[PDB]
């Protein structure tokens, strides 16, 4: 393996705008929820990271943040009650909220860069975009990739035109990371080495 053994513990979070979107079906959106882990776990295997789902939690009731048109507030408001909240249920490393807000400008998904396992920080959200599993779990996967210290592919450091961290998304996309995301990962590793994702479950 390129990589070291790393282990992220995920919490992820469904809105109530998602639940109503999937007839308020539980069983139905934890299927839908595992099944986009699976796919997340898949595209982490070259990275040597073992993803798991630590934690779901299903809005059933109503929203407990203001879910709002933009993500990176949104994505802040999401920070804090994790923090106050989510935490003190079970621990975790890294949070996602999925959402069927239509996020502005075509947005779907948005984190902050290099801040896994801070208490804050180490979360995403992320619209659930498409009725293909698939390509919201690549957009999940996307979003954690920046959480890793991932910024943007860039044509003149590697040749990947759709891996998972091109600027936008589009049908042609790939469930690799390209090159640039393993650099950037690999200084990730080398300069920041947060301590929570060296800790298996």
């Known amino acids: 393996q390129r990589f070291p053994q790393r282990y992220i513990e995920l919490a992820i979070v ?3 705008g998602m639940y109503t979107k999937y007839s308020s079906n539980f069983k139905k959106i934890r299927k839908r929820v595992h099944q986009m882990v699976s796919n997340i776990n898949e595209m982490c295997r070259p990275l040597n990271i073992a993803i798991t789902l630590a934690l779901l939690d299903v809005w059933s009731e109503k929203d407990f943040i203001t879910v709002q048109a933009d993500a990176p507030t949104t994505a802040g408001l999401f920070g804090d009650w994790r923090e106050r909240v989510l935490l003190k249920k079970k621990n975790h490393d890294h949070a996602q909220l999925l959402t069927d807000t239509n996020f502005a400008r075509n947005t779907i998904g948005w984190a902050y860069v290099g801040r896994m396992c801070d208490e804050k920080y180490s979360v995403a959200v992320v619209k659930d975009h498409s009725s293909k599993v698939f390509m919201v779990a690549v957009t999940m996967t996307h979003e954690l990739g920046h959480n890793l210290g991932m910024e943007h592919d860039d044509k003149d450091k590697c040749k990947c035109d759709t891996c998972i961290m091109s600027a936008v998304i589009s049908d042609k996309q790939s469930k690799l990371f390209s090159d640039c995301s393993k650099d950037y ?16 479950p």
């Open 14 to 16: 469904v809105d109530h």
């Open 185 to 200: 990962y690999q200084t990730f590793l080398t300069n920041d080495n947060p301590q929570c994702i060296l800790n298996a």
